[PDB]
Symmetry: C3
Subunit: 146 residues, 3 copies
């Protein structure tokens, strides 16, 4: 089986991110969750690693171009989730850009399910700042940490 990179800021990690990973796992020998910089990066990477206990998942900080990171980690797939039509336009453009940058890497999309489509990082982060309960939307460990 191939290896996939699942990049994001994960600021915070949501139930939606976890769902995408769990749903994609049967296709890949390994999924590497690559955390890009924007609370601290290392804190976020630790937090993700504690939530994602499946042995096929590795969490690392994303440095450099994603396609270079993918090459380095022997990954020929980029995993992305799609929540809405507004996502699709940007991801479609990024997939194309990354294809031109490195045609050996393929981008695949899983649709956000059910009650994950509205749950976005910037949305959840807005809630946290205003003092709202965000625990329905994130893993328990993340809620505790927030």
């Amino acid at each position: 089986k191939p290896i996939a990179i699942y990049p994001g800021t994960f600021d915070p990690l949501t139930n939606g991110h976890v769902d995408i990973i769990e749903r994609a796992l049967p296709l890949f020998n390994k999924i590497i969750v690559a955390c890009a910089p924007t609370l601290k990066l290392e804190e976020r990477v630790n937090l993700i690693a504690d939530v994602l206990t499946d042995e096929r998942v590795e969490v690392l900080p994303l440095t450099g171009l994603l396609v270079d990171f993918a090459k380095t980690h022997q990954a020929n797939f980029i995993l992305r989730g799609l929540r809405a039509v507004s996502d699709f336009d940007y991801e479609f453009q990024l997939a194309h850009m990354n294809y031109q940058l490195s045609p050996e890497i393929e981008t695949i999309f899983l649709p956000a399910r059910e009650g994950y489509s509205y749950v976005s990082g910037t949305m959840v982060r807005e809630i946290v700042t205003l003092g709202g309960d965000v625990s329905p939307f994130v893993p328990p460990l993340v809620a505790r940490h927030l």
Copy 2:
């Protein structure tokens, strides 16, 4: 009749904002125009109150979560205007988020009419910064103030 909250930054208040309020009034006992922070908040709230003379309208500063503000002010409806397809995606996601946060509150949309669809706050604000006449797009009081 129920009570609605009409939230926004209103920076500046446009003819389009006023139009949405006037058109929604027949459905509500009261509309509370909730001004979120981003010229000063208190100046903006004063300016809106001077423009919106209908006794069913109250202008207040928005603190905290919108659904909490709505609860506090006995409002079970959130009024939003929709100008374009790009609006809809974000408002649809926010309506869902607010439903999960507080299922007792309902979100309703009125479409922007006619020659209000292109008139957006960030658009009008760009014009002001560059020294353009923005008086066709805002209430006279707001034009004077700008």
Copy 3:
């Protein structure tokens, strides 16, 4: 023939920008490439002028409202390129706004071709920051300069 203004930040100038200009030239006596501020403006204007050698092209810095700039330079057309559905919504709103600001000016669109649709300024700029090769996407002069 009429005169068109082709405004943008051109930060950096891409092959896609050049393509739009070349494709539009047969319709206009002159195209004025108007560079808005956001590496330095004057450096960017110089760089564009060196790339665009066709005598019907003039490069200048954009000051003030675009419709005022257009009037000053005897231009009754604004040239814009469209890459994606996400572009269209914003350009449609801006065209309308500029029509109300100055109904004598017309906005026209050319679709991005082929392998230019994904190549956007903020995309290319993200690549440069991370140390990627951006030379497939920009004119040689621009690549050298970056």
